[PDB]
Structure formats: C-alpha cells, structure tokens
Amino acid sequence: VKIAVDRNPVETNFEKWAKPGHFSRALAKGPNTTTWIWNLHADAHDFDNHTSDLEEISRKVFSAHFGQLGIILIWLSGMYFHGARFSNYEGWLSDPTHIKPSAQVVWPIVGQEILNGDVGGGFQGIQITSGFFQLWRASGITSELQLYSTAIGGLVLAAACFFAGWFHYHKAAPKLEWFQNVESMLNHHLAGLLGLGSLAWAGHQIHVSLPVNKLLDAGVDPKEIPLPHEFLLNQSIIADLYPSFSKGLAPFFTLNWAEYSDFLTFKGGLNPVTGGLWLSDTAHHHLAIAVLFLVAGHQYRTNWGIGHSIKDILESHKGPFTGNGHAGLYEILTTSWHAQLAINLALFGSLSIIVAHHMYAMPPYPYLATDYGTQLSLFTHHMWIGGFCVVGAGAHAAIFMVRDYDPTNNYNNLLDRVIRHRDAIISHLNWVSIFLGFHSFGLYIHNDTMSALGRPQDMFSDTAIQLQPVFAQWIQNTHFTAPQLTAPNALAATSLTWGGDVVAVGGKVAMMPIALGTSDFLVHHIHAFTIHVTVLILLKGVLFARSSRLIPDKANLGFRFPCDGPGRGGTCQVSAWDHVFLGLFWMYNSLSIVIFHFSWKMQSDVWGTVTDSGVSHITGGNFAQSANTINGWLRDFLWAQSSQVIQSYGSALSAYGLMFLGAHFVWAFSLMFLFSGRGYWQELIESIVWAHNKLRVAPSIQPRALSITQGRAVGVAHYLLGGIATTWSFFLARIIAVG
C-alpha cells in the first residue's frame, strides 16, 4: 500500500460554472425546458451519471467528503460562538438547577423580541434544547472567554478542511489504487481514527475530572475554580484532589496497575444529589474503546507478511447449502461506492437509534436528567436520522444493483441464491404483516368496541384481562440480579429503569424505574408491525430492480423512473425509487409511533416531582388504561398534551405554534402533489401560457410541469416536512411547559 495522486488534474477556473450541467452532456447543451433546472439540481451529485470514470467518481466523493466536513466544523464553531458571545452560560453555570439554557437572542423589529424568554442569569433569549451547556460543563469551562478561542480553532480547522478537499481534487487527485486500499482504509479508520481519538479523549477526561466531580459540585463558583492549566501542571493540586497522583507514574511502566483507583473508577449509577454521572466511568470506557479499536485495527496483512488479507478470509468461508460463497464481495465493495455507502447506512441509522435508546435511559452528562426536554429532543432527532439513514441504505442497495453490478466478475453464489428465491421472502413477509396487522392493530379495535358496548370488564386491561409481556421482564430480572450474582465486580444494574431507587433532583425525579404492561406489549407489537412493513417495502424494492415477474427488461429502464406504461391493467410505482418513496412514508409512521410511545411513557410513568410522600408525576398515570385503545391516544395524550402548542401565543413559545400550523399547511400541500398527476396541470399551464402569449410576456424557456418522479419527490418532501415539523413543534412546546 502506497500513495498515488496526480498533479493538476483539473485546472482551477470559473469557466465550468458559467455552463451549468456540464457534468451531464445532455444538460450542458442548454435549458430549452424548465425541466432542465430540476435535472441540474437532481443530478449534480449523481457522480456515476456524469461519466463511467470510477476514478473521477472516487475523486469526486473523496472531495465532497471534505466539502461536508467543512460545513460540519463551521456548524460546530457557530454553536460554540453562539454560546460564547450571547448566552447565559455563566449564569447557567453558577446555578444549573433552575436557570434554563439559552443561546439565541432575536432582534427587536416587529415584536419578535417576545421570543426572548426570561431564562434568568441576567440575560433573556431563546431557550435551546440541543444540549450544549450540559456538554460544555463537562469540560471545566468557567467563563465565556474560552468558547471564543474554541470556535476560532474550529473555524480554522474547517478552512483547512475545505483546503484539503480542494487540494485532493485539483492538486492531489488520487487514483483508484489508493481509494481501494480496504486494508489501509480499515487499519487507519479502525485503529488510528478511532483508537487514537478514543485514547486522546480518555486522557482528556482523566485530566479534566477535577472541576466537575469535586469543585463544580461543591458550590465553588467557576471564577473561584482554578483554571484547568492550574490543575494539570501543579503536582500539589492533583495530589490534594486525588491521592493516586504524584506517585511517580510507576504502576503504568511495570504494568502493576494497582494504585490507579482515584481516576479510573467503576461505580455505575449516580447520586440523587449530583444529578449527573461521573467522568471516571467515561474515562475508563474510552480507554477500553481505545485499546479495543487499536488492537482490532491490527488484524490484516498489509506489507510485512504479518496477518491475513480480506480476500483469503472471504474465500475460506463456504458451506454445504450455498457452496462457493463470498466469491467476489471484496470486488463488490472495491468496485462501487454505492455498495459501500448502502452497507454503511444499513447499520449506521440502526446504531443512531441505538444511541438514542442508550441516551434516553442513560444520560451521559451532568445536570440534564431533570431537563426533561433535551432528552426527548435528542432521542427523537437521532431516531428520525436513523430512519432516514436506513431508508437511504435501502435505496443505495438498489442503486448499486442498477448501475454498478454485473454477475460475471462480481459473481457470488450467495447473491444469486438470495435472488433465486426473491419471491418466497416477499410472500411470507406479506403473510407475516397480515398476521401482525390483524393481531396488533385489531386488538385496539376490539378494545374500543368493548369499551363502547358498555362492557368494561371484557376490555383488554391490566385489571380485566392481563396481556403483559414477561420476556422483557425476564431480561430486566437478569439485569437486576446481575450485580453480585452474574456481575460480581459491578455495583449497580445496567440502568435505573427497572431497579427502583427513585432518584430525584430538586423535586423533579431524575430517574424512576419504567414499568412494562399490556400497553407496552401492544405498542411494541405495533412497532414490530410497522418496522416489518417498512423492511418489506424496502426489500421488495431492492430485489425487484434487476428483474421481475411482469417486466423482464427492467434494468435498462434505470433506477429513477415512475412506471413503464398503462399496459397490463396499469403499471405505477414499480421502480425501486418508488419503493423508497413508500418506505419513507412507512419509516415516518413507525418512527412517529415509537416517539409518541416514548414521550407518553416518559411523561406518565417516569417523570414528575417528588413530594414528602412519594412522587407526583406529570399525568395521573394515564398510560395504563389508555394505550389499550386507539381513543386513549386521543383521550389523554394527543388531545390533552396539545394545550400548550395552541395556547403559547401569549409567551415566547408562539413560534412553536406558528411552526405547528405551518407544518400542517405544508403537509396538506404535499397531499396536493401526492394525489394529482401532470395532465391536468400541464393543460392548465397550457391555458396560462395562452394568457401570457396575448401580451407577449411568455418566457423563452418552455415552462413544463414537474416530472412525475419530481412530482412524487415534492410530494414526499412536503409530506415528511409537514409531519416531522408538526411533531417537532408539539414535542418541543409541550415539554418546555412541564419541566
């Protein structure tokens, strides 16, 4: 493995900008129709549509990566600079218990300054639910003078990132030999980018655990706290704080790791007074991650006859049923970028949702468990990002199968065996979805019917007839008895969501164990139903893309086409693009159901304020006998919790109601596109063009309606926009007035 770039492959000049659509020779000729602009936009990134030069495609991708990371770094710098210049971060820092986070202050123009909610700290502004103040408190920041320099560094790094992108595209454009170094790419991502970063961040958390764990949590004013450099160098300070220091760094040379117990500690749980977790656990976790990902990046033969490559491993895996498997998957990946992108996004969104699940019940920051709003925000954010990533992986799988695929050199018996029974899977998953729909949704119909017929003793209930799960409860039991029985060295359980010990900070309970009854059983079955239907849509789009039972010549029609023709009774939404279209709607449905379940569980059976005698939750435990019926979701959750979003015009939360109504509007607006076609619209444009030509004011570019694919794209775009925006406004206006 070596480096291979070329010098001045594309000269830097502003000419190719004057001709939009140059990358597509069909578009570069000229915009004779208004569809030209939309194709310019929908194809600028379609690198494999510009030309079949996979070298140029890899260069384009490796440059767009820096193009994205530059925006990422400018975004982080903007967040830090908002926190620095105008915010109550010092006020929040001196009193985190009651003061709320605010980092955006509006301009006085038309009365919008009412949005500057009174948050205290001698400053007014917009409350933020991103979670940056709690994240910064874990870094020993004492004053605003540090965030300025941090943002300066971030912005310099973003400038250097754009510089590196331009450099590797126009001055050091690599070759496919460098891009296809899977060995190097892995052993440097897995070992270097991950292991080295984890070790550095662990060493950081080790030498920053003084203020947060001891000084910040002892009423010491941040100005009173000695600066971090005063903690790092002076050995007397770190000897007074933690006795394990100033020993001489002896135990780490001879590996006699016995005396290092004051800063690498394993406790688990949290003090019902400290509010947050401790930095020693995170430091130990990051050292474990560093060691693990650093050793794992050393299991591949690269140059010096040490290890084993990926091709031999793929070749040495064959079985009786399949036979000659994994023949060319290495080439599958090294050939197309779409294959790698789909494989990544496959579990990338899944791990994002897993991070959401590991964050809502395990807040890894100080003074945020009582902040009932940031948890919901981050949880729902990451779950929607994961849903989009999974749907995008489903789309890029078919994308790979369309352009960059041929079962001759990339041949694999695994893939062709999957293809040869591509219909039994679809049929059986259809039957399973029917099963789940009649057995997870019909139960709600039965419950509504029983509650309406005047027979409450017959409805499904935790009191009339119980239908709660035990397997999840058995998992919680194995985790609860894990300490001292199956986890000797451990102190607490995995999470306080099933171990009692109601932890409360300032009335508000920081965490209370979560129950699992018939309602959770039904809602998890609904979740499984929706997820299986979404997977059905995506997989039936991916498989039936090269060939099908109806149209055999389906690969030549491409990936992005609306139909084939009104023949054989009618063909509509047959392309994998349309299956991704429908999978977006199903992912919306599933993620929405899951986030509503999360919100209503957390507000009914988890969150509340603790009085002298027990804890008084937000709602009076309305989750028990409302989730068993569809009307319950409108009885105590949707109807009840919507008072603030429609009653917030009197305060700084009116923008939430404005976004609420606007999202409803754009949703119905999307319905417009989704239910209509082009014939009507094209003829209406015809009559409008007639009206124009009478005064000689029509355009030279032929005004055509949107393409069918673009019509469906606009439909789904506005649809998800309205939906997600309405749900965002609701979950973000409801949770501020209850925390």
């Binding site: 509504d448 019917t449 509650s451 309406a452 409450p456 209930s461 009653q647 109601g657």
Partner: protein, 73 residues
C-alpha cells in the same frame, strides 16, 4: 369550510357570546383551538374506563370516519 363557518357562527351565537366569534374568527389558531380542540370533549369522553354513556357510539363512529379517511389515503 362552509359548514365549519356556519356551525361555529351558530355555536358562538347559541352560547350568548357572539363576541367570541367576532374576536377569534380573525385568524387560524382560533379555528384550530376555539372550535376544533374545544368543542370535542364529549367525543373523547364518550367511553372511558370510568364508564361510557350515550355518546360512545358517536365517538366510535367518529373514529370509524378517520379509519375510512386513512384507507382513502
């Protein structure tokens, strides 16, 4: 739209508070709050664990309508 207008006009008129209409019929948040969210408490409470009443069948039909609407979609 015509039926919403007529209904909410005569609804503000029957409560003896036509000023409610004259003051809230100016924007859309009023239509959403003062009419849709407000005058539906008996639809939600037609049947509940406390016990149903004569308005339960009408609530179940109100849900049936939404089910048919979603099947249309």
């Amino acid at each position: 739209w015509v039926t919403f207008y007529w209904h909410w006009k005569h609804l503000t008129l029957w409560q003896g508070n036509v000023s409610q209409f004259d003051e809230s019929s100016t924007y859309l948040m009023g239509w959403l709050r003062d009419y849709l969210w407000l005058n539906s408490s008996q639809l939600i409470n037609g049947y509940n664990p406390f016990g149903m009443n004569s308005l339960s069948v009408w609530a179940w039909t109100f849900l049936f309508g939404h089910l048919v609407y979603a099947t249309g979609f």
